[PDB]
């Protein structure tokens, strides 16, 4: 679990969005595993606006943050697992690292701010849904 709180927006994995998120929806995209809902209180997170490929992510299944190198956002075939079927996911970045389903929502950050959230994994990889291209998160 986990979310990004930027301005009056809450960014979560689409497959973990609550009824309140869907009832206060701003934007959603099934191909990216992302959903953004509106919030009453303003949040403190800053979104990175950059092309970094190194950063740090939070892994809840280890209670640890790890430094990683990650690929630029791409359309990737995500393999099937014990818990979720195979599917194509766009705007996804991959790194070598540990992740389990409950790690979804952990933040990946670079020197410029939040880059994305954990969205895929297994087989020794962790995948993050990018948010750096959603420039509208910074306005209104
Ligand atoms: C982050 C990560 C890591 C390992 C992962 C997955 C999925 N199967 N494995 C081995 C994963 N992502 C997803 C995407 C959809 N989910 C469902 C599955 C049960 N709870 C969820 O949130 N998990
Ligand atoms: Zn950066």
UniProtKB/Swiss-Prot annotation:
It comes from the Viruses. It catalyses: Selective cleavage of Tyr-|-Gly bond in the picornavirus polyprotein. Zn(2+) 1 binds at residues 50, 52, 110, 112. The active site is at 15 (for protease 2a activity), 33 (for protease 2a activity), 104 (for protease 2a activity). Cysteine protease that cleaves viral polyprotein and specific host proteins. It is responsible for the autocatalytic cleavage between the P1 and P2 regions, which is the first cleavage occurring in the polyprotein. Also cleaves the host translation initiation factor EIF4G1, in order to shut down the capped cellular mRNA translation. Inhibits the host nucleus-cytoplasm protein and RNA trafficking by cleaving host members of the nuclear pores. Counteracts stress granule formation probably by antagonizing its assembly or promoting its dissassembly. Homodimer. This is Protease 2A. It comes from Coxsackievirus A16 (strain G-10).
């Amino acid at each position: 679990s986990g979310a990004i709180y930027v301005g009056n927006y809450r960014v979560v994995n689409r497959h973990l969005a609550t009824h309140n998120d869907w009832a206060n929806l701003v934007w959603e995209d099934s191909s990216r595993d992302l959903l953004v809902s509106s919030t009453t209180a303003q949040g403190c997170d800053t979104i990175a606006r950059c092309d970094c490929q190194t950063g740090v992510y939070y892994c809840s299944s280890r209670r640890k943050h790890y430094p990683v190198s990650f690929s630029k956002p791409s359309l990737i075939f995500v393999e099937a697992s014990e818990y979720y079927p195979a599917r194509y996911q766009s705007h996804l970045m991959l790194a070598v690292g540990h992740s389990e389903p409950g790690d979804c929502g952990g933040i990946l950050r670079c020197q410029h701010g939040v880059v994305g959230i954990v969205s895929t994994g297994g087989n020794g990889l962790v995948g993050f849904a990018d948010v750096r291209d959603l420039l509208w998160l910074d306005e209104e």
